[PDB]
Design an enzyme around this catalytic site. Structure first.
Site, PDB file in Angstrom:
ATOM      1  N   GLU A   1       2.665   5.253  -4.003  1.00 31.24           N
ATOM      2  CA  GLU A   1       2.699   6.238  -5.088  1.00 31.24           C
ATOM      3  C   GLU A   1       4.041   6.952  -5.398  1.00 31.24           C
ATOM      4  O   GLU A   1       4.305   7.188  -6.578  1.00 31.24           O
ATOM      5  CB  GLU A   1       1.603   7.295  -4.879  1.00 31.24           C
ATOM      6  CG  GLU A   1       0.161   6.768  -4.996  1.00 31.24           C
ATOM      7  CD  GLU A   1      -0.291   5.884  -3.845  1.00 31.24           C
ATOM      8  OE1 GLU A   1       0.121   6.129  -2.693  1.00 31.24           O
ATOM      9  OE2 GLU A   1      -1.075   4.941  -4.102  1.00 31.24           O
TER      10      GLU A   1
ATOM     11  N   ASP B   1       0.819  -1.203   0.000  1.00 31.86           N
ATOM     12  CA  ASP B   1       0.000   0.000   0.000  1.00 31.86           C
ATOM     13  C   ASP B   1       0.869   1.276   0.000  1.00 31.86           C
ATOM     14  O   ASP B   1       2.094   1.186   0.085  1.00 31.86           O
ATOM     15  CB  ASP B   1      -0.940  -0.056   1.203  1.00 31.86           C
ATOM     16  CG  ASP B   1      -2.015   0.991   1.153  1.00 31.86           C
ATOM     17  OD1 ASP B   1      -2.389   1.399   0.032  1.00 31.86           O
ATOM     18  OD2 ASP B   1      -2.504   1.381   2.239  1.00 31.86           O
TER      19      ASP B   1
ATOM     20  N   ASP C   1      -9.551   3.563  -2.116  1.00 36.09           N
ATOM     21  CA  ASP C   1     -10.452   4.125  -1.118  1.00 36.09           C
ATOM     22  C   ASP C   1     -11.757   4.628  -1.712  1.00 36.09           C
ATOM     23  O   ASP C   1     -11.941   5.824  -1.922  1.00 36.09           O
ATOM     24  CB  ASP C   1      -9.756   5.241  -0.335  1.00 36.09           C
ATOM     25  CG  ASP C   1      -8.599   4.723   0.491  1.00 36.09           C
ATOM     26  OD1 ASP C   1      -8.616   3.520   0.837  1.00 36.09           O
ATOM     27  OD2 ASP C   1      -7.683   5.507   0.810  1.00 36.09           O
TER      28      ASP C   1
HETATM   29  C1  LIG Z   1      -7.330   5.851   5.270  1.00 35.92           C
HETATM   30  C2  LIG Z   1      -6.772   6.749   4.172  1.00 35.92           C
HETATM   31  O1  LIG Z   1      -6.368   7.977   4.786  1.00 35.92           O
HETATM   32  C3  LIG Z   1      -5.828   8.965   3.892  1.00 35.92           C
HETATM   33  O2  LIG Z   1      -6.779   9.444   2.932  1.00 35.92           O
HETATM   34  C4  LIG Z   1      -7.829  10.283   3.418  1.00 35.92           C
HETATM   35  C5  LIG Z   1      -7.396  11.733   3.639  1.00 35.92           C
HETATM   36  O3  LIG Z   1      -6.338  11.863   4.598  1.00 35.92           O
HETATM   37  C6  LIG Z   1      -8.613  12.532   4.104  1.00 35.92           C
HETATM   38  O4  LIG Z   1      -8.248  13.898   4.315  1.00 35.92           O
HETATM   39  C7  LIG Z   1      -9.734  12.457   3.070  1.00 35.92           C
HETATM   40  O5  LIG Z   1      -9.339  13.163   1.891  1.00 35.92           O
HETATM   41  C8  LIG Z   1     -10.351  13.293   0.889  1.00 35.92           C
HETATM   42  C9  LIG Z   1     -11.143  14.583   1.079  1.00 35.92           C
HETATM   43  O6  LIG Z   1     -11.974  14.506   2.238  1.00 35.92           O
HETATM   44  C10 LIG Z   1     -12.048  14.844  -0.114  1.00 35.92           C
HETATM   45  O7  LIG Z   1     -12.629  16.139   0.049  1.00 35.92           O
HETATM   46  C11 LIG Z   1     -11.252  14.783  -1.412  1.00 35.92           C
HETATM   47  O8  LIG Z   1     -10.263  15.828  -1.439  1.00 35.92           O
HETATM   48  C12 LIG Z   1     -10.261  16.459  -2.704  1.00 35.92           C
HETATM   49  C13 LIG Z   1     -11.061  17.749  -2.708  1.00 35.92           C
HETATM   50  O9  LIG Z   1     -12.419  17.467  -2.459  1.00 35.92           O
HETATM   51  C14 LIG Z   1     -10.925  18.443  -4.055  1.00 35.92           C
HETATM   52  O10 LIG Z   1     -11.476  19.738  -3.978  1.00 35.92           O
HETATM   53  C15 LIG Z   1      -9.473  18.585  -4.443  1.00 35.92           C
HETATM   54  O11 LIG Z   1      -8.836  19.545  -3.578  1.00 35.92           O
HETATM   55  C16 LIG Z   1      -7.981  20.437  -4.277  1.00 35.92           C
HETATM   56  C17 LIG Z   1      -8.708  21.463  -5.147  1.00 35.92           C
HETATM   57  O12 LIG Z   1      -9.276  20.898  -6.312  1.00 35.92           O
HETATM   58  C18 LIG Z   1      -7.753  22.542  -5.626  1.00 35.92           C
HETATM   59  O13 LIG Z   1      -8.486  23.568  -6.255  1.00 35.92           O
HETATM   60  C19 LIG Z   1      -6.976  23.117  -4.467  1.00 35.92           C
HETATM   61  O14 LIG Z   1      -7.876  23.742  -3.580  1.00 35.92           O
HETATM   62  O15 LIG Z   1      -6.298  22.074  -3.811  1.00 35.92           O
HETATM   63  C20 LIG Z   1      -7.167  21.144  -3.214  1.00 35.92           C
HETATM   64  C21 LIG Z   1      -6.381  20.128  -2.409  1.00 35.92           C
HETATM   65  O16 LIG Z   1      -5.230  19.722  -3.113  1.00 35.92           O
HETATM   66  O17 LIG Z   1      -8.842  17.334  -4.383  1.00 35.92           O
HETATM   67  C22 LIG Z   1      -8.834  16.764  -3.100  1.00 35.92           C
HETATM   68  C23 LIG Z   1      -8.026  15.487  -3.124  1.00 35.92           C
HETATM   69  O18 LIG Z   1      -6.659  15.820  -3.158  1.00 35.92           O
HETATM   70  O19 LIG Z   1     -10.631  13.504  -1.500  1.00 35.92           O
HETATM   71  C24 LIG Z   1      -9.663  13.319  -0.471  1.00 35.92           C
HETATM   72  C25 LIG Z   1      -8.903  12.026  -0.733  1.00 35.92           C
HETATM   73  O20 LIG Z   1      -7.801  12.296  -1.605  1.00 35.92           O
HETATM   74  O21 LIG Z   1     -10.036  11.087   2.783  1.00 35.92           O
HETATM   75  C26 LIG Z   1      -8.918  10.306   2.353  1.00 35.92           C
HETATM   76  C27 LIG Z   1      -9.371   8.905   1.952  1.00 35.92           C
HETATM   77  O22 LIG Z   1      -9.715   8.125   3.101  1.00 35.92           O
HETATM   78  C28 LIG Z   1      -4.645   8.390   3.120  1.00 35.92           C
HETATM   79  O23 LIG Z   1      -4.200   9.347   2.154  1.00 35.92           O
HETATM   80  C29 LIG Z   1      -5.033   7.090   2.423  1.00 35.92           C
HETATM   81  O24 LIG Z   1      -3.863   6.561   1.799  1.00 35.92           O
HETATM   82  C30 LIG Z   1      -5.592   6.098   3.443  1.00 35.92           C
HETATM   83  N1  LIG Z   1      -5.947   4.813   2.836  1.00 35.92           N
HETATM   84  C31 LIG Z   1      -4.963   3.729   2.813  1.00 35.92           C
HETATM   85  C32 LIG Z   1      -4.542   3.354   4.220  1.00 35.92           C
HETATM   86  C33 LIG Z   1      -4.855   2.188   4.818  1.00 35.92           C
HETATM   87  C34 LIG Z   1      -4.478   1.971   6.268  1.00 35.92           C
HETATM   88  O25 LIG Z   1      -3.272   1.200   6.350  1.00 35.92           O
HETATM   89  C35 LIG Z   1      -5.592   1.090   4.111  1.00 35.92           C
HETATM   90  O26 LIG Z   1      -6.504   0.504   5.051  1.00 35.92           O
HETATM   91  C36 LIG Z   1      -6.358   1.641   2.916  1.00 35.92           C
HETATM   92  O27 LIG Z   1      -6.920   0.560   2.159  1.00 35.92           O
HETATM   93  C37 LIG Z   1      -5.424   2.478   2.054  1.00 35.92           C
HETATM   94  O28 LIG Z   1      -6.056   2.824   0.811  1.00 35.92           O
END
Ligand SMILES: C[C@H]1O[C@H](O[C@H]2[C@H](O)[C@@H](O)[C@@H](O[C@H]3[C@H](O)[C@@H](O)[C@@H](O[C@H]4[C@H](O)[C@@H](O)[C@@H](O[C@H]5[C@H](O)[C@@H](O)[C@@H](O)O[C@@H]5CO)O[C@@H]4CO)O[C@@H]3CO)O[C@@H]2CO)[C@H](O)[C@@H](O)[C@@H]1N[C@H]1C=C(CO)[C@@H](O)[C@H](O)[C@H]1O
Ligand SMILES: *[C@@H]1O[C@H](CO)[C@@H](O[C@@H]2O[C@H](CO)[C@@H](O)[C@H](O)[C@H]2NC(C)=O)[C@H](O[C@@H]2O[C@@H](C)[C@@H](O)[C@@H](O)[C@@H]2O)[C@H]1NC(C)=O
Ligand SMILES: *[C@@H]1O[C@H](CO)[C@@H](O)[C@H](O)[C@H]1NC(C)=O
Ligand SMILES: *[C@@H]1O[C@H](CO)[C@@H](O)[C@H](O)[C@H]1NC(C)=O
Length: 830
Positions: A419, A416, A515
């Protein structure tokens, strides 16, 4: 504007040998935008096979980054060139594909089909429009093809969550491996697969080709329906066109290049249970016991990062998961025919009393930046990242796995966070155009800097290779190293599951959609994603059943196990901050689980055969309807139904409160696998409104197919000891056929020269007064030694009953025949 493009300075087809085309291109005029133009391009076109054309465009004057041959082995390039408008044509007599170089200003090229004269890929510029040009700057490559907007149906360019399988017009697809949840639509996710399939609806309906850009750099791909444009921030153009002409042929051609799908052990097709948040060894024991008590099949128990000592690889929590109890637990699993898979992350915690860290330092295995190990942040806190491009790091990786496996037996590995994921974004290097590139790809849908929550582009790998170039390969490389570790420490066929991927990952690992969320949307989203990874050469695919993130509902989880019991990879998994979601928790879900996992287990010999087919020819296990029915254009846009193998179709309910489903049925006769009396017959494909009660899913088999089934059991090992039941579905229009592959479940080289395997082919045909069912057997020995017996045949698809010397159902009992012995069975009509 953006650029002025290139002219052909010289071009020639080598003669008097296997033709290749070589050309020199010259920059028309320089432009400052997105940085310095490359003045001279070397351009080659060559046939790797009759069905595969390669177009390679490099800097004539400098070596540029290319994915190393050691990472992805492939034929080397054709020589380079020497130091109405004109054209240079390259064609081969046995190839359907014709390449043409147009000596226009700026230049163009096309690839069209000999059979239909249809143009497949058209990079002729519109002279007034630089967006249609080939542009080639150090950190900006632009390559564009026009498309017949209505006729071209495109699929692929992963990894992205989408509501449709067929790509919507007018969108941008970004490929840049990122720790972004798959419950997010559109955004770039964990993997990068710069491949698309293009199915044409006219003129020769079902005519299919493939297009692959062998490039590991970040990119945007713009699809507007009548055009597709790559915008790539480094590397070279290395473009492959796969001739098809059928969908199955394209994937054969593509996986021939990138690698055949790895085989899977028989047990990997059993049901898997996992959770982030299991507290101790007692809890996981309890889960296993409760599955048995509910009489729900469970094959594999997983442990997430909970098992580790404070989230450090290659350790055990001495309190919650002590070694002795874990040893007893795994021993117990094994005694009962079950298996165990733990997780691993790539980051190594910087703790000075941690053996893995000490040894890693000693062999200098970690990724560096500015001359020192790059310091990331993940679950155990501060980490260094192993450089899986470094042979010394791979050896280190193998050694740590050996050490761990020597103390605690494992059956597979889950890799896991690869990236690589980093919880702190580093400051960009002052003045660096790598950390601050001139063209911003649409990372996370917000033009977010490529270094966000990962390893910075200026970090360095073995051979002075930059993170900028190698980023999308990190997961891929770790998968190679982990598989290497497993093969070296056990003679069983290995099993691994990886989050981050690149084209070619399927040769090493399974994948899951990551996820997702406990939402009705994600339930449906699992289908397009499942189908895509089949196209990507990764047939062992599934999603977290009932949803990873957010708390599930009884109804959603019930509908999800119904669908998910048919994923190639079938696993229940969830985050720790949500409600528990084991299948025994609700009675209505448990009852549904027993029904659908019951059918799945009976279908294990079928799944295993499809896995065999995938390794052989690249053909996916879970495949789109148009793979079997490419002449039916209505199937091209289907996103809520899929096939398992050639002739079994799954039609799930994907909305709350529903007790029916409008399902497309291709032409012909279809029989419910849950009730052979229940059938669908159409003369022309159409939508049919199927009954779908809360505990039922529609699963149908098409006429013309034969499927060998075994009995239900609690474990895959137990199922294999049951009798075979042959399902024969007759057609008035074609003889029925089917296939069964058998081996010991763990041979390293599937269907190899070692002979520990059997292949059976089945055949059935009706005459006016008789019916013949027969088999042909290759390598009879293995199957004979396993004592497999076929005791019953059920015959669907006829309107008259048959016996030994609307539709009806015929059953032939007490046959006692040996599967390993070829047979011919004569039946008569009543
Ligand atoms: C358990 C897992 O935890 C982590 O992942 C979590 C994040 O930590 C948590 O914050 C959340 O993140 C979500 C957001 O809640 C959601 O809103 C979305 O974010 C988007 C956002 O909506 C969107 O607007 C955009 O933001 C940009 C925007 O476009 C731009 O204009 C400017 O403003 O910048 C912003 C931000 O850059 O994009 C955002 C995404 O970047 O989606 C995110 C998710 O990416 O939820 C996630 C998911 O749960 C870890 O990162 C994961 O790796 C972890 N999961 C792994 C861990 C395990 C435990 O060992 C395993 O069990 C799991 O199977 C494994 O996958
Ligand atoms: C280095 O690894 C050690 C072994 O896991 C860590 O010690 C352990 O920390 C556990 C909680 O994280 C605790 O339950 C264990 O009892 C303890 N074991 C031993 C043998 O000390 C160590 O953790 C650091 O030291 C402890 C005392 C706490 O202060 C933690 O917060 C520290 O991180 C690890 N040290 C580092 C610097 O990572
Ligand atoms: C099987 O299907 C038929 C036709 O749809 C129906 O009449 C019959 O009751 C079904 N049997 C069972 C056991 O569900
Ligand atoms: C079916 O065909 C076989 C072989 O051709 C023949 O011997 C037999 O008589 C036929 N059966 C009937 C009922 O006619």
């Amino acid at each position: 504007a953006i650029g002025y493009g290139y002219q052909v300075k010289n071009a020639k087809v080598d003669n008097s040998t296997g033709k290749s085309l070589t050309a020199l291109l010259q920059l028309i005029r320089n432009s400052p935008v997105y940085g310095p133009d490359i003045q001279f391009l070397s351009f080659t076109a060559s046939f790797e096979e009759d069905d595969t054309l390669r177009i390679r465009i490099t800097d004539a004057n400098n070596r540029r980054w290319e994915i190393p041959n050691e990472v992805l082995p492939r034929p080397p390039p054709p020589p380079s060139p020497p130091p109405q408008p004109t054209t240079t044509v390259l064609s081969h007599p046995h190839s359907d594909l014709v390449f043409t170089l147009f000596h226009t200003t700026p230049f163009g090229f096309t690839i069209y089909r000999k059979s239909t004269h249809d143009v497949l890929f058209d990079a002729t510029p519109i002279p007034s429009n630089p967006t249609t040009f080939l542009i080639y700057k150090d950190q900006y490559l632009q390559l564009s093809s026009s498309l017949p907007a209505q006729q071209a149906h495109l699929y692929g360019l992963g990894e992205h969550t989408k509501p449709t399988f067929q790509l919507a017009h007018n969108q941008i697809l970004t490929l840049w491996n990122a720790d972004i949840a798959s419950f997010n639509r559109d955004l770039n996710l964990y993997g990068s697969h710069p491949f698309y399939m293009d199915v044409r609806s006219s003129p020769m309906v079902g005519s299919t080709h493939g297009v692959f850009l062998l490039n590991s750099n970040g990119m945007d791909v713009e699809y507007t329906g009548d055009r597709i444009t790559y915008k790539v921030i480094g590397g070279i153009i290395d473009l492959y066109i796969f001739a098809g002409r059928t969908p199955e042929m394209v994937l054969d051609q593509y996986t021939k290049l990138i690698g055949r799908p790895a085989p899977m052990p028989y047990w990997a097709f059993g049901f898997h249970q996992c959770r982030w948040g299991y507290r101790d060894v007692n809890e996981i024991e309890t889960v296993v016991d409760k599955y048995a008590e509910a009489r729900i099949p469970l094959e594999v128990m997983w442990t997430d990062i909970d098992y580790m000592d404070a989230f450090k690889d290659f350790t055990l929590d001495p309190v919650h998961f002590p070694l002795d109890k874990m040893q007893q637990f795994v021993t117990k699993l094994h005694r009962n025919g079950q298996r165990y898979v733990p997780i691993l992350d790539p980051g190594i915690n910087t703790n000075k009393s941690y053996g893995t860290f000490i040894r890693g330092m000693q062999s200098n295995v970690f990724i560096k930046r500015d001359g020192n190990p790059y310091l990331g942040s993940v679950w155990p806190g501060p980490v260094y990242y192993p450089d899986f491009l470094d042979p010394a790091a791979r050896s280190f990786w193998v050694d740590e796995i050996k050490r761990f496996r020597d103390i605690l037996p494992i059956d597979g590995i889950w890799i896991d966070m690869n990236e690589a994921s980093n919880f702190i974004t580093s400051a960009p290097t002052p003045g660096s155009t790598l950390d601050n590139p001139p063209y911003k790809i649409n990372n996370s849908g917000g033009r977010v800097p490529i270094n966000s929550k990962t390893i910075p582009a200026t970090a360095m790998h073995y051979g002075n290779v930059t993170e900028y170039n190698a980023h999308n390969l990190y997961g891929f490389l770790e998968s190679q190293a982990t598989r290497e570790a497993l093969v070296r420490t056990s003679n069983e066929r290995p099993f691994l599951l990886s989050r981050s991927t690149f084209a070619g990952s399927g040769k090493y690992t399974a994948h899951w959609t990551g996820d997702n969320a406990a939402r009705w949307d994600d339930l449906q989203y699992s289908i397009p994603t499942m189908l895509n990874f089949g196209l990507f050469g990764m047939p062992m695919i599934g999603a977290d059943i009932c949803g990873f993130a957010e708390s599930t509902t009884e109804e959603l989880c019930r509908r999800w196990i119904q669908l998910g019991a048919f994923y190639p990879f079938s696993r229940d998994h969830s985050a720790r901050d949500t409600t528990h979601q084991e299948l025994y928790l609700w009675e209505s879900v448990a009852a549904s689980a027993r029904t659908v996992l019951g059918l799945r287990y009976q279908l294990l010999p079928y799944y295993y055969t499809l896995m065999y087919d995938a390794n052989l020819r690249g053909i996916p296990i879970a495949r789109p309807l148009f793979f079997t029915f490419p002449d039916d254009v209505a199937t091209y846009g289907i996103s809520s139904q899929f096939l398992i193998g050639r002739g079994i179709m799954v039609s799930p309910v994907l909305q709350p409160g529903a007790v029916s489903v409008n399902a497309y049925f291709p032409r012909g006769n279809w029989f419910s696998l849950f009730n052979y009396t229940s059938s669908v017959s159409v003369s022309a494909g159409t939508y049919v409104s199927l009954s779908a009660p809360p505990d039922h899913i529609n699963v149908h088999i098409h006429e013309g197919n034969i499927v060998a089934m075994q009995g239900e059991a609690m474990t895959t090992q137990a199922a294999r000891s049951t009798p075979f039941h042959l399902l024969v579905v007759m057609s008035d229009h074609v003889a029925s056929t089917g296939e069964l592959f058998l081996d010991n479940g763990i041979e390293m080289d599937i269907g190899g020269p070692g002979g520990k395997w059997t292949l059976v082919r089945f055949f059935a045909e009706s005459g006016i007064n008789n019916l013949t069912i027969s088999s042909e057997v290759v390598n009879r020995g293995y199957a004979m030694s396993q004592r497999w017996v076929m005791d019953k045949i059920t015959i669907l698809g006829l309107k008259r009953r048959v016996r030994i010397k609307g539709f009806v159902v015929s059953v032939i009992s007490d046959l006692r025949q040996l599967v390993g012995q070829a047979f011919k069975l004569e039946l008569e009509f009543e």
